[PDB]
């Protein structure tokens, strides 16, 4: 299953864990947005990030990771939900760069100097937003820093996307978080050591099943694990596109009407919504009557 998260807790519930295989989801993002190889990795990592926190979201929460910087990708946005769905986008889907010195996709260079935001939308009038400076721009470590500093949850994220000309081959990772800091220091140290010892996801996920990866982290096999299916999903529809156009100035709608057509593209899933001259005339007529 290449769209599956596994999750649970260890050590009398003082540690929580998440591990995901989601090449299918990242492949869908790549195709919907026609992402370059580099943009696939950057956004993929962000999507994995969002996915990994899904088990821990409140009811009907939307959780958004919003990384913004001065590198040529400019912005990376990944949203997950309590329903185990994700969606996301980058400002520059066609970004290309030389590989880094170690021959990997230059995620850090794509993002450049900037910041990481987490938006928690939990059904109050406006969402909680927390912003921190980037640590490295590799996404994993940036997100672990957010958790340590804003949420006071010591964290390790490990995340990897492997993509070639036939598409995304691996897109997965894990998250280990200390939710109760009275956890014995030797359990802390051992977890730390075991993770630091693991190969990067691209290599680890070709060699080990998710549950065996976890056994390696915790020094013993895990106990109870829950699973869920991660899906790429957006809530856009045509009604919403039409409303998007109704908020525009009369002049914009006139200009489309003389152009012969109006188009709305959903930024999250790249779905295009095309409106005819008549449909625009209808919306304009509505603008005057309202």
**Residue numbers of the site for Cl ion (CB under 5 A)?**
21, 23, 170-172
Beta strand extents in the chain (DSSP E only): 4-10, 15-21, 62-69, 75-81, 85-90, 114-121, 128-133, 155-164, 167-178, 226-229, 231-232, 261-265, 272-276
Could you list the residues that contact Zn ion (CB under 5 A)?
Answer: 234, 236, 266, 268-269, 271
Based on the shown chain and the rule CB under 8 A, indicate whether residue 183 belongs to the binding site for its own copies: no
The whole-angstrom separation of Cα 182 and Cα 185 is 8
Least distance (Å) between residue 235 CB and Cl ion: 25
**Given the complex with Zn ion, which of 193 and 272 has the nearer CB atom?**
272
Q: How far apart are CA 147 and CA 141, in angstroms?
A: 10
Whether 176 and 195 have beta carbons less than 8 Å apart is answered as: yes
Contacting its own copies (CB under 8 A), which of 100, 113, 200, 206? 113
Q: Which is nearer to Zn ion, 21 or 87 (CB)?
A: 87
The phi-psi region of residue 204 (left if phi > 0; otherwise alpha if psi is between -120 and 50; otherwise beta) is alpha
Among 91, 115, 188, 265, binds its own copies (CB under 8 A): 115
> Among residues 134 and 269, whose Cβ is nearest to its own copies?
134
CB of 184 to Cl ion, least distance (A): 33
List the interface residues with its own copies, window 205-264 (CB under 8 A): none
198 binds, among Cl ion, Zn ion, its own copies, none (CB under 5 to 8 A by kind): none
Alpha-carbon distance values, 257 to 35, 262, 275 (Å): 31, 7, 9
Nearest to Cl ion of 136, 206 (CB atom): 206
What whole-number distance in Å separates Cα of residue 156 and Cα of residue 143?
A: 9
Q: Using CB under 8 A as the criterion, which residues of the chain lie in contact with its own copies when the complex forms?
A: 113-115, 124-133, 149-150, 152
């Amino acid at each position: 299953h290449h769209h599956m998260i596994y999750y649970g807790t260890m050590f009398d519930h003082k540690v929580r864990f998440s591990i995901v295989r989601m090449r299918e989801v990242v492949e869908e993002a790549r195709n919907r947005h026609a992402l370059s190889y580099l943009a696939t990795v950057v956004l993929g990592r962000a999507l994995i990030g969002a996915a990994l926190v899904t088990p821990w979201l409140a009811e009907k929460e939307r959780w958004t990771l919003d990384i913004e910087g001065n590198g040529p990708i400019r912005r990376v946005v990944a949203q997950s939900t309590s329903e185990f769905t994700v969606r996301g986008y980058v400002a520059n889907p066609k970004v290309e760069l030389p590989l880094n010195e170690k021959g990997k996709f230059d995620v850090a260079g794509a993002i450049g100097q900037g910041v990481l935001r987490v938006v928690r939308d939990l059904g109050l009038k406006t969402p909680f937003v927390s912003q921190v400076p980037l640590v490295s721009g590799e996404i994993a470590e940036d997100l672990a820093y957010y958790f340590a500093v804003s949420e006071q949850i010591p964290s390790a994220f490990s995340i990897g996307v492997l993509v070639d000309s036939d598409g995304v081959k691996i897109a997965g990772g894990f998250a280990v978080q200390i939710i109760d800091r009275t956890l014995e220091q030797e359990k802390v140290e051992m977890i730390e050591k075991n993770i630091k010892n693991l190969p990067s996801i691209s290599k680890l996920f070709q060699e080990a099943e998710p549950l065996d990866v976890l056994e390696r982290i915790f020094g013993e096999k895990v106990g109870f694990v829950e699973t869920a299916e991660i899906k790429y999903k957006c809530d856009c529809n045509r009604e919403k596109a039409k409303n998007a156009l109704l908020v525009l100035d009369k002049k914009e709608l006139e200009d489309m009407r003389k152009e012969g057509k109006g188009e709305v593209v959903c930024k999250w899933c790249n779905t295009r919504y095309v409106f005819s001259e008549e449909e625009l005339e209808e919306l304009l007529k509505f603008k005057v009557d309202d």
